Amino acid sequence: FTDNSSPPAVPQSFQVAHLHAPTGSGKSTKVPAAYAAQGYKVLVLNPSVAATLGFGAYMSKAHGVDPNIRTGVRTITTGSPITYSTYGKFLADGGCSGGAYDIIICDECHSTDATSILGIGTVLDQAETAGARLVVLATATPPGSVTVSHPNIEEVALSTTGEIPFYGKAIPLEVIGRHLIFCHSKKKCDELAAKLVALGINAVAYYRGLDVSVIPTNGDVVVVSTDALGDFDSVIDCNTCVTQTVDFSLDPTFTIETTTLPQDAVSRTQRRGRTGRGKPGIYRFVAPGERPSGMFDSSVLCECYDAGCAWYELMPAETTVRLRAYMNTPGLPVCQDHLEFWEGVFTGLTHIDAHFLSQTKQSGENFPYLVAYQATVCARAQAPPPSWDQMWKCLIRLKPTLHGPTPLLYRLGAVQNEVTLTHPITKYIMTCMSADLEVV
Amino acid sequence: NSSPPAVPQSFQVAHLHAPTGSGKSTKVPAAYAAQGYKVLVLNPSVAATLGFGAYMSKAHGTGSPITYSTYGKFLADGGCSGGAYDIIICDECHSTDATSILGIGTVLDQAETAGARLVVLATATPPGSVTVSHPNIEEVALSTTGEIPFYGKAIPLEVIKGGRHLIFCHSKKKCDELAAKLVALGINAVAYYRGLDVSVIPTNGDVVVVSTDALMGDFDSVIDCNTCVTQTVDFSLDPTFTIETTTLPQDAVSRTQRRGRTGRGKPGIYRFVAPGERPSGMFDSSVLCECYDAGCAWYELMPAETTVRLRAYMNTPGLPVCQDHLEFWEGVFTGLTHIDAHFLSQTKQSGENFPYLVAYQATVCARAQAPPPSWDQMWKCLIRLKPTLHGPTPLLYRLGAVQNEVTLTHPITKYIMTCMSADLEVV
Numbered sequence A: 001f002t003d004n005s006s007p008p009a010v011p012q013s014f015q016v017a018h019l020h021a022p023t024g025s026g027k028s029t030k031v032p033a034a035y036a037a038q039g040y041k042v043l044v045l046n047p048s049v050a051a052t053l054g055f056g057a058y059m060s061k062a063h064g065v066d067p068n069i070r071t072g073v074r075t076i077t078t079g080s081p082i083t084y085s086t087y088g089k090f091l092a093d094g095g096c097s098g099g100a101y102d103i104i105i106c107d108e109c110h111s112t113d114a115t116s117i118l119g120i121g122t123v124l125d126q127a128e129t130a131g132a133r134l135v136v137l138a139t140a141t142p143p144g145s146v147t148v149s150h151p152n153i154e155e156v157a158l159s160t161t162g163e164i165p166f167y168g169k170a171i172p173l174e175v176i177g178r179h180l181i182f183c184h185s186k187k188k189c190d191e192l193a194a195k196l197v198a199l200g201i202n203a204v205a206y207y208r209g210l211d212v213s214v215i216p217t218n219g220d221v222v223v224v225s226t227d228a229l230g231d232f233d234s235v236i237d238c239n240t241c242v243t244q245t246v247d248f249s250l251d252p253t254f255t256i257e258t259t260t261l262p263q264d265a266v267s268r269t270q271r272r273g274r275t276g277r278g279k280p281g282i283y284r285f286v287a288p289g290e291r292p293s294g295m296f297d298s299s300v301l302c303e304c305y306d307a308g309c310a311w312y313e314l315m316p317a318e319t320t321v322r323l324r325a326y327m328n329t330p331g332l333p334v335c336q337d338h339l340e341f342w343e344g345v346f347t348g349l350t351h352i353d354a355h356f357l358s359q360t361k362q363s364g365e366n367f368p369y370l371v372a373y374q375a376t377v378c379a380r381a382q383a384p385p386p387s388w389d390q391m392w393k394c395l396i397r398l399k400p401t402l403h404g405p406t407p408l409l410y411r412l413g414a415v416q417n418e419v420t421l422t423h424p425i426t427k428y429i430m431t432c433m434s435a436d437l438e439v440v
Numbered sequence B: 001n002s003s004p005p006a007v008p009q010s011f012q013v014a015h016l017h018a019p020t021g022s023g024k025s026t027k028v029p030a031a032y033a034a035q036g037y038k039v040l041v042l043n044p045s046v047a048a049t050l051g052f053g054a055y056m057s058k059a060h061g062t063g064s065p066i067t068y069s070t071y072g073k074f075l076a077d078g079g080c081s082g083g084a085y086d087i088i089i090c091d092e093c094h095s096t097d098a099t100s101i102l103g104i105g106t107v108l109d110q111a112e113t114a115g116a117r118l119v120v121l122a123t124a125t126p127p128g129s130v131t132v133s134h135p136n137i138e139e140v141a142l143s144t145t146g147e148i149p150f151y152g153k154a155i156p157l158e159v160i161k162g163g164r165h166l167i168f169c170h171s172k173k174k175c176d177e178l179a180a181k182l183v184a185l186g187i188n189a190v191a192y193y194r195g196l197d198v199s200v201i202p203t204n205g206d207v208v209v210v211s212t213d214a215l216m217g218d219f220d221s222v223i224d225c226n227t228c229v230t231q232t233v234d235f236s237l238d239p240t241f242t243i244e245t246t247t248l249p250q251d252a253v254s255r256t257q258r259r260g261r262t263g264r265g266k267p268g269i270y271r272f273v274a275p276g277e278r279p280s281g282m283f284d285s286s287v288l289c290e291c292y293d294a295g296c297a298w299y300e301l302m303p304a305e306t307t308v309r310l311r312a313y314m315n316t317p318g319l320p321v322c323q324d325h326l327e328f329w330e331g332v333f334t335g336l337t338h339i340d341a342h343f344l345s346q347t348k349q350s351g352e353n354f355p356y357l358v359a360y361q362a363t364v365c366a367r368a369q370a371p372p373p374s375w376d377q378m379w380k381c382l383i384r385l386k387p388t389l390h391g392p393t394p395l396l397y398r399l400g401a402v403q404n405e406v407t408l409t410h411p412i413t414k415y416i417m418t419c420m421s422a423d424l425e426v427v
């Protein structure tokens, strides 16, 4: 392991190097290009499909280089020594295929969505055996990072005085041309935009579900958005974010739920970053502080196992090997060590209904395997799902499976039916909790 | 900011990131005093940092220009007295214990009106700080190879067989079990945790100390589980909230301090389960709840006065962050009226966490002549209990395990539930 602000030279024998470098300095473009120029074959991994496809187009337009591009929706093979791929497509491709790459760049290695973590873990477990010389863990914001001040951005502490209440402070009359306003939830987007629209401001709301097309492509506007997202004259930031957490609630087992926390440094820099691009921008904030970057929640580990089982045909023990490699590697975001627990949970979930899994994968549920497995248990007990929320629509053949209480394995959302807590799988998960979660 | 802030011309709040060395309560305050300024230095404690030696409050070290005190004494003294000091140094301002947070918040809210010219927020570990290497300490990852299982890894007998070693576990139960395993292998292992003191052989024979963070000789190596137990609040709606303890990865302050009990003078070895840590700079909402509790129980502070001090804290950049629940907690404690003064006196004197919350739950039990949620030691102010053995507990909130059956219909419960829906986002 090594620490760099400049591209690590290819060593003679295998090594993992940390690259901490600004976003503009072309981690995903100049770095792989300089490696390609030395004659190496380079894989560049990114969380985002749009980023991945976007690097292909840039390299073509700016350098007449047509890289291979590998994403879920689109795959291009040119034979270039440079390959751009998403973490998710990399995992679908089986991970590291022997002899293909000399160098693997794990870009935005600070990313803590499940795909990045399983993806980087997989690279770390497999790259050396596959014949890679160098693995580069690249990010502009390593663990512990805090937001630094931006030359072109005015940062203005908010206060009490204004004609709209904003998160314990106030958004004043005046300074809402084109502005972006970050709220933590969809409903406070709608309610703040319904307020601004009735106030005569051309304000429109965005969040997941809505399509970006609904946003006024230039011309005076005030956008009220979650993180689920042109450039603006200023950014206004509630400084909080809604994140997914697991609660070991013992009712009977665990709960996946959401929590509102102060934003971490990655959130703040990004939200701030939507202004001041070339032209001087202004940043308004409810709160002066922020969590440092570099932690993620145990619920993301659950996701990795869910995706391993649902998308990538990994036995839980195989997903554990990849994730263990991630957690044994220094300089990466950290999480509770719950690998044994989640491996245990998922290993106990046998003979899932393949049709139900296909539907939950199709409909884009957050834990397709967990959802399809609960529905599997419900159908075979001829019991109802835990609610009739759209999450459970693979059971719409409702009419027979109404017999009584729900055999509740875990809580993935609100539970509305009456429940029974003595299913063998429920008891199995409880035993895994006693076995693998540390007490006190 | 790496060196003492020059005294400004109008009131300012400066920060001092100083090295792990070059003390900020000992060399830095002297330089301010040599310029005619009256300096107040606040720390969590004025016991010598080593654990041995003079108190910092020692006369010469008295009509002197430098006063050494604590956040706890400062709050009990009523905060800032008018015109008493030019410079107030809030040292160790990364501390996220309730007393430190309420104390610093008080300094920030009051200093300028008291005529201070400068407030210095000094720490060796500003928010985002990560553990840095140590010239004198070799660090080695534990593998899965070894006789002694240890948090998913293993300790080889060789690295602790003979010599003097310190091993951190996250709980008493874990220390007992590990010590037992080691003794059964012919190791001289002693367990240490809250309430023992001296069984750690003051000798320097071979020994393996298995300990929590309760620990106050010296060691050839440290082995770290890299986890800690912390107090958290759960908004569980059963009926209201729960103060509970949970296990979490250690942060950089904890890692640095644990690792630091080896490599004192002679070289040392640090062996770890996890290569990483939580970065420092965040604390739980339950600490805010503690501030209001302590405000009501100890400092004669109306909730709105606690809010003012806490708000000053949260408006100041460079300090640990927390969820903005001031309005929620202020609202909760505002509703808690007519506490029985005699139960409060007892929960205060027994050293319980949340004495105001314990005594208030007890008060509500005595009036409805209902039993406490359990008979754990927490509820002993009620021990004259034969009358109030009747019926379910009017449960306000959960401060521990609940064994009696409960009613959720008390007005105070409803009130706190409503505060949750309106002041948080948790219905």
Ligand SMILES: COc1ccc([N+](=O)[O-])cc1Cn1cc(CC(=O)O)c2ccc(-c3cc(N)cc(N)c3)cc21
Residues within 6 Å of the ligand: A049, A070, A071, A072, A073, A086, A087, A088, A089, A090, A092, A113, A114, A115, A118, A303, A304, A307, A308, A311, A312
């Ligand atoms: C909604 O999809 C997901 C959502 C979450 C996760 N996860 O947390 O790991 C993984 C996936 C699966 N996934 C995420 C990507 C990234 C991308 O869209 O480029 C991807 C890409 C390809 C495949 C894939 C494609 C085929 N033909 C077959 C299989 N088994 C997977 C699955 C892929």
Ligand SMILES: [Ca+2]
Residues within 6 Å of the ligand: A247, A248, A249, B234, B236
């Ligand atoms: Ca809970």
Ligand SMILES: [Ca+2]
Residues within 6 Å of the ligand: A247, B234, B235, B236
């Ligand atoms: Ca919870």
